[PDB]
Amino acid sequence: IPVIEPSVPELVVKPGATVTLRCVGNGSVEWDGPPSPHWTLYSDGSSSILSTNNATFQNTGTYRCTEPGDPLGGSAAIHLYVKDPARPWNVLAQEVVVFEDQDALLPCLLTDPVLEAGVSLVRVRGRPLMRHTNYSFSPWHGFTIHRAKFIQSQDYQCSALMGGRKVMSISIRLKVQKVIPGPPALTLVPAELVRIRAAQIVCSASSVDVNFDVFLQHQNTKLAIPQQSDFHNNRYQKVLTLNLDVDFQHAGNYSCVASNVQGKHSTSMFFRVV
Amino acid sequence: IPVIEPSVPELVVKPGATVTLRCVGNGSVEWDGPPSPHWTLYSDGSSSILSTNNATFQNTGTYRCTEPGDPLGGSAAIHLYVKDPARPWNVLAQEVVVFEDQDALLPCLLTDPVLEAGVSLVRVRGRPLMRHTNYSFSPWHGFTIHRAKFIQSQDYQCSALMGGRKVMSISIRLKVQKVIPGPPALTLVPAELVRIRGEAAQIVCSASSVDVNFDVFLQHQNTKLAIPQQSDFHNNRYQKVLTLNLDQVDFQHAGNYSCVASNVQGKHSTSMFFRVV
Amino acid sequence: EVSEYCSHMIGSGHLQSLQRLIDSQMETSCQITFEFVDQEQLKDPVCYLKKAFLLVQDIMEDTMRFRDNTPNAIAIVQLQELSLRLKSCFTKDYKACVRTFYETPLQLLEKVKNVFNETKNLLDKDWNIFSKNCNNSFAEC
Amino acid sequence: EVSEYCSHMIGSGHLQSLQRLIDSQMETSCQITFEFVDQEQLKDPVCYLKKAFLLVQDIMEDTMRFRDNTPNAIAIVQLQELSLRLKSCFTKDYKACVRTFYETPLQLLEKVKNVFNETKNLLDKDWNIFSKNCNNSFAEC
Ligand SMILES: *[C@@H]1O[C@H](CO[C@@H]2O[C@@H](C)[C@@H](O)[C@@H](O)[C@@H]2O)[C@@H](O[C@@H]2O[C@H](CO)[C@H](O)[C@H](O[C@]3(C(=O)O)C[C@H](O)[C@@H](NC(C)=O)[C@H]([C@H](O)[C@H](O)CO)O3)[C@H]2O)[C@H](O)[C@H]1NC(C)=O
Ligand SMILES: *[C@@H]1O[C@H](CO[C@@H]2O[C@@H](C)[C@@H](O)[C@@H](O)[C@@H]2O)[C@@H](O[C@@H]2O[C@H](CO)[C@H](O)[C@H](O[C@]3(C(=O)O)C[C@H](O)[C@@H](NC(C)=O)[C@H]([C@H](O)[C@H](O)CO)O3)[C@H]2O)[C@H](O)[C@H]1NC(C)=O
Ligand SMILES: *[C@@H]1O[C@H](CO)[C@@H](O[C@@H]2O[C@H](CO)[C@H](O)[C@H](O[C@]3(C(=O)O)C[C@H](O)[C@@H](NC(C)=O)[C@H]([C@H](O)[C@H](O)CO)O3)[C@H]2O)[C@H](O)[C@H]1NC(C)=O
Ligand SMILES: *[C@@H]1O[C@H](CO)[C@@H](O[C@@H]2O[C@H](CO)[C@H](O)[C@H](O[C@]3(C(=O)O)C[C@H](O)[C@@H](NC(C)=O)[C@H]([C@H](O)[C@H](O)CO)O3)[C@H]2O)[C@H](O)[C@H]1NC(C)=O
Ligand SMILES: *[C@@H]1O[C@H](CO)[C@@H](O[C@@H]2O[C@H](CO)[C@H](O)[C@H](O)[C@H]2O)[C@H](O)[C@H]1NC(C)=O
Ligand SMILES: *[C@@H]1O[C@H](CO)[C@@H](O)[C@H](O)[C@H]1NC(C)=O
Ligand SMILES: *[C@@H]1O[C@H](CO)[C@@H](O)[C@H](O)[C@H]1NC(C)=O
Ligand SMILES: *[C@@H]1O[C@H](CO)[C@@H](O)[C@H](O)[C@H]1NC(C)=O
């Protein structure tokens, strides 16, 4: 495992301060951390050095050192705080995407750890968090919304209490996605049919999301049927109803096929004319 | 049928007027009408005469003449209006009782027929009628509320429009009663039951009526059991349920369980059999 | 004559219907004016409910209006029919000794629910409680 | 992200939930204050709905509050999820051009229902209607 000097878990500096992070391994090592300005990098065979003369709030975050080519070597980390009196937040990302019932980390890094007792998570335009929003805060990482829900897909802001006034971070958009298992669930009925030269064929598909197609095709030439669409039991339905008030040219292989961002699904039946 | 003179369907007079109603048939005849003051009665063998010198608003109503010695001979009628400028209403009764879905006549007699174009039925203290109150008016009889409901059991007033101001009759209390068909409806389950001694069993005696005033008890043979009954109001009906729980049955628990319920109508009974193997 | 069935008359089903009606209402800051019995002038629990029961009748007619054939509308009707039956438990007297309120619809509903609930409680303890003359109680107003 | 699935998105089930929510509300004279688009400044049907849809979001959070796990509360949640889905169908650029209202809760509900209903109607005719720039429309305010 590589070794970082200074051997301290974290540093707290003022804007303008000089910071020098040095890492040493057996083989070549490399630093990763916040995409930030004014960093100079010195590297040779066994060691690598990050250094800046003008440390800024954007430099706030965890700096991790690893030795590539050593497998299972592990990493070493150090956290930098640049306590800008004007800028309490270093936002790493303005967009976050997760699925429902996952934790959602909003990566606003606090630039001064003593502020933690007076921080909160809010929405843009001063609106309050959605009802029953389960969340917690870590200085090194930011706010984590626990077991995220679709309803919580909002634009957020990190609030820091400095001299009475609450100072906001830049907005962070959270996308919570419904866990869509696969292609739309099909129901084509009847499975078998045979008539003398009336009949009914209903192609249906249903998913928790609206963004999905469904088509009924005779053979490989799709038919133009207006689809009835309704939302029930927290699910979207899309039904193609074919009415033949029949003949030999109507017989054949009716395939009911529905697609979405997941993929395409298909079910089919046979229609005979005697 | 007896004959009334004057041969007119109705009369309209002022307070103070003299009114004389004469009836004639073959044999004794009799007048009936509003219980009212100042009426003098002259009667003889084939004729009878009502007469007053001081006609008042209370004299307003239908006066019917019948010949009690003729069976099926019929009656003759005439209606009197005494148009008191102060008293538009002659109320015959301050209490009326009917059953649900019956017409309910509130007998406020209008003392002046020209007033009809501007009469209404209202509730006391200025309250408006209940919602969806179907009603109509007849000058000779009063307001009839059609297909009366329990909810309409209220104190009413007859409104007459005279010189801008609405003039009220004395209050009339209407009682609408729920039609209780018969004894409480029973549901005893299970109809059949058989258990092994030591096992468990349950017998629930239940009864339900629109009214709360009804008893229900469950009896083993003819010796009634002491079971605490749960009582609740649901689906606009009162329920009273006796629940028998025997966690540890035996041979003496077997027998003729009768579920019987009573009310002012009568008593209803249903039963089942319990076997122990 | 005041029955022994003065209890068993206000069922739990009645209270559930009220609760569902309350739970269905939108939580809003709007206030409505209505006449109701003053707790200050009537600290007496038995005489408070007596005066309250008379007043809830007008409340349900004037304020608690719902669309025809809706679940809440049906509930109100039943509560009104319930109150007619309850008349034979409350002995007659004579107005006044009451005050104007200005509260949210939910708060008004809570008052009415409290009236029905406590009346059921008291009748369960003794069904002949509300057959007392509160003319003396109605004097100190 | 606008798509051909802008239709089929506002189902009749949504409108039923709204109607049931409306039908459950007590008819009261109380008025509530809220911010909403002025029909006078926006006679344009397409640009009216555009401005309204944004405002309905704040209405459902601030005003349309119901007890947890009640049928109405669930209905509101669904309408809110619906509105998230209806996003990316409405193109928008830079508040204001609106007026304060003082109406009954039922009237507010009718406005919101009308917003959802008419939006469904238009999207059925053409799903790409609300992708027009109303910056010019928002000028005359
Ligand atoms: C420490 O860093 C300062 C900031 O450098 C910038 O900010 C960091 C976070 C990075 O984004 C980096 O890439 C940037 O260059 C050094 O620059 C001086 O710092 C001030 C703020 O403290 C300001 O940024 C100065 O730049 C200007 C500018 O934005 O160009 C100079 C302009 O003349 C001036 N406006 C006009 C029209 O005159 C603006 C405005 O004053 C601000 O934009 C609004 O207040 O500032 C920048 O030169 C700083 O030199 C360095 N200290 C050292 C090396 O000792
Ligand atoms: C026609 O009848 C009038 C009323 O006859 C009485 O009233 C009817 C309804 C029956 O109850 C009957 O049994 C009664 O005898 C004759 O006299 C006067 O008419 C008015 C009309 O309504 C009234 O009935 C008179 O009684 C009062 C009154 O209202 O004037 C009752 C009052 O309480 C009383 N005091 C008041 C007005 O404050 C007054 C007098 O002041 C009393 O002396 C009280 O000290 O009397 C009733 O006497 C009427 O005379 C007769 N017509 C003819 C031509 O005979
Ligand atoms: C109604 O129409 C559809 C569409 O024509 C029919 O589906 C066809 O049925 C076939 C049954 O043997 C195959 O499932 C076929 O799918 C393919 C494929 O995905 O490519 C067709 C290929 O020709 C076939 N390849 C070979 C070499 O035979 C391929 C193959 O089975 C797999 O690669 C092996 O795993 O399958 C499909 O298009 C319906 O059957 C028809 N009737 C009914 C009643 O549904
Ligand atoms: C033991 O349980 C049985 C059922 O498991 C009960 O039977 C029925 O109970 C009814 C009361 O709830 C009646 O008493 C009914 O009486 C009869 C009868 O016993 O014969 C029914 C007969 O149908 C009827 N005769 C006809 C027309 O067939 C007969 C008759 O009308 C007169 O009642 C005779 O005087 O009445 C009965 O079958 C028992 O009640 C219950 N207890 C006992 C002690 O048997
Ligand atoms: C919020 O998320 C928490 C995830 O760590 C979760 O944790 C639980 O907290 C409970 C109190 O709310 C309780 O004390 C548990 O033993 C603990 O595991 C918590 O359940 C979540 N909150 C809600 C309301 O679901
Ligand atoms: C350093 O790496 C070399 C080459 O893999 C290896 O031979 C040597 O043993 C390593 N030394 C230590 C101290 O890990
Ligand atoms: C007496 O009454 C009888 C009824 O049977 C009738 O036929 C007859 O004409 C009457 N006579 C007189 C004088 O009224
Ligand atoms: C009112 O009475 C008329 C009489 O026929 C009847 O048609 C109507 O249904 C009644 N009640 C209603 C529905 O208002």
Overview of this protein structure:
The PDB classes it as cytokine/cytokine receptor. The entry lists the keywords cytokine-cytokine receptor complex. The complex is a heterotetramer, with 2 copies of chain A and 2 copies of chain C (141 residues). By secondary structure, chain A is mainly beta. Chain A folds into 3 domains: 83 residues, Immunoglobulin-like, CATH 2.60.40.10; 96 residues, Sandwich (Immunoglobulin-like), CATH 2.60.40.10; 95 residues, Immunoglobulins (Immunoglobulin-like), CATH 2.60.40. In chain A, 0% of the residues lie in helices and 53% in strands. Chain A is elongated and about 90 Å long. By secondary structure, chain C is mostly helical. Chain C has one domain: Growth Hormone, Chain: A, CATH 1.20.1250. Chain C is built from 4 helices and 2 strands. The two termini of chain C are 30 Å apart. The chains are: A mainly beta (274), C mainly alpha (141). Chains in contact: A-D, B-C, C-D. Bound molecules: a molecule of 4 linked components (NAG-GAL-SIA-FUC) (2 copies), a molecule of 3 linked components (NAG-GAL-SIA) (2 copies), a molecule of 2 linked components (NAG-GAL) and 2-acetamido-2-deoxy-beta-D-glucopyranose (3 copies). A molecule of 4 linked components (NAG-GAL-SIA-FUC) binds next to loops of chain B.
Output the keywords:
heterotetramer, A: 274 residues, Immunoglobulin-like, 5-stranded mixed β-sheet, 27 strands, C: 141 residues, mainly alpha, Growth Hormone, Chain: A, two-stranded antiparallel sheet, 4 helices, 48% helix, binds a molecule of 3 linked components (NAG-GAL-SIA), binds 2-acetamido-2-deoxy-beta-D-glucopyranose
